[PDB]
Design a protein around this ligand. Sequence first.
Ligand SMILES: O=C(O)c1cnc2c(S(=O)(=O)O)cccc2c1O
Length: 438
Amino acid sequence: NPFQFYLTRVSGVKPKYNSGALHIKDILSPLFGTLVSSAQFNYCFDVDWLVKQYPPEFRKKPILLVHGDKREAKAHLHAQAKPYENISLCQAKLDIAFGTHHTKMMLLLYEEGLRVVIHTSNLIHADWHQKTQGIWLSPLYPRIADGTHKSGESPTHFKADLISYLMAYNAPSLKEWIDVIHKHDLSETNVYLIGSTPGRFQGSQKDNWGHFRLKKLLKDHASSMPNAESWPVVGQFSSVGSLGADESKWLCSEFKESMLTLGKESSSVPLYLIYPSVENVRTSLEGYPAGGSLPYSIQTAEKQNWLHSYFHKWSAETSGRSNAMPHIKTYMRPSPDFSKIAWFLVTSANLSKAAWGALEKNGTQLMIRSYELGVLFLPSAFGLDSFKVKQKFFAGPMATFPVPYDLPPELYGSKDRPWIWNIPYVKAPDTHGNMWVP
Ligand SMILES: O=C(O)c1cnc2c(S(=O)(=O)O)cccc2c1O
C-alpha cells in the first residue's frame, strides 16, 4: 500500500483482523525511529497511561501535550503531568464559546528524521482497546542538510499547510515544532491536510479551514465525471452537533455542497450518514459503555429528528470490526455501485458546525469553533482517476483504498434508534450483562 492508512488494534478479534493494525506502542516503538522529542495533540489524556506507551528507553524524552482544557479541567491535567519532569503542556487558545481542541496528532522527532501521525484516538486506554479508530502515518521525513536551501515541500503543499495549521495556535512551544518541520523534507507526502482552527474567516482566508478547505481542494484537485450526481456522499462519525430545524439549514445547504464539489465547473446526490444504532452499541465488544464515547444527547437529538432518516448502521465485516464501535470519523465519495471512490478523508471532525464551520454574515464569513485535523486522499495525488475500494480491508493491486467499513451502508431498520448517550436502555442487556442507566 502507498496510503499508510491503518486501524488501531482491537482486543478480542481474531489475529487476521489485527495483522495490519497498529497499537500506540507500535507507533512509538524504536522500530519507527529513535525518539528525541514528541508532541501529542489531543483532547483527553491519561498521562500515566500515555507515558507507559512509550518504550522504556524513550520515556524521559521531552513530551509536549497540546490540549484545550481550561479552569479545573486544566488544573487536573497539570496535576496529572506534574510527576513527569519531561512533560510540558500547551493550552490551545479557544477564544470562541463552546470551542474544543479535538485535533489528534503526534509529532515524532527522531535522530533519523521526523514523522507526523494524524489519527482519531484520545490518549486513554479505552480509545485504543476495542474501538474502530483510524491512523495516517507519514513517511520518515529526512532532515534537510544544514546550508542546503530547498523547500522540502510536497505536491500537496502539506509542509506549508501543516506549518500554517500550527501557526494558528500562536503558541511558543509550537513555534519550536514549526522550526523542526522547516528543517525537514516533507516532499514525499501524498495527502492533503484539512484542518479547522477557531475563528471567523473571510475573503482570502475563507478557503483555509473546515468544509471550505475541503471544497477548495476538491475544486482544484479532483475531476468531475459524467453522472457525478449519482456518486453518493458518505459521512461516518461518532458525535452529532445541533444542525438546525431541517436539512436546509446547514447539512444539505453548505456542508453537503462542499462535499459534492468536484472540479472547477459550477442536488439529488444521495447522502449516507453512518452512526451506531442502540443495537450496534448493545451488542458491541464493550457493550453499553461504548456509548460513553458516542455523546449524542437527547436534548440535541429531539430538535432534529429529520436527521435520523439519513442514518445507517455501523457495519465493518470487511475489517472484522462490526462489534468495535467507531471513534474514527471518515467522509468519502463512492461511485454509484460503491466499487470506486473519488476521495477519502479521515479526520477528528464529527458531524457538527463547530468542527466544520458555519457561514455567517450573509454568507461572507466562515465561523469555526474548534481545532480539528484530518488528511485527504485524492486519486490525482497518486496518479489515478479514482481509487478502487479494497474488498477485504486486510487482504492482498496495492492501488485499492482500504475502506474500513462495509459498503453500501445499511439503513436503520424501523425499530432502530440512534445511540443517545444520556437516556436509559433497560429493555435488553449488553454483552457484559448490564443495562445503561445514566
Ligand atoms: O474524541 C474527542 O475529541 C471526544 C470529545 N468529546 C467527547 C465527549 S464530550 O466532552 O463532548 O462530552 C464525550 C465522549 C467522548 C468524547 C470524545 O471522544
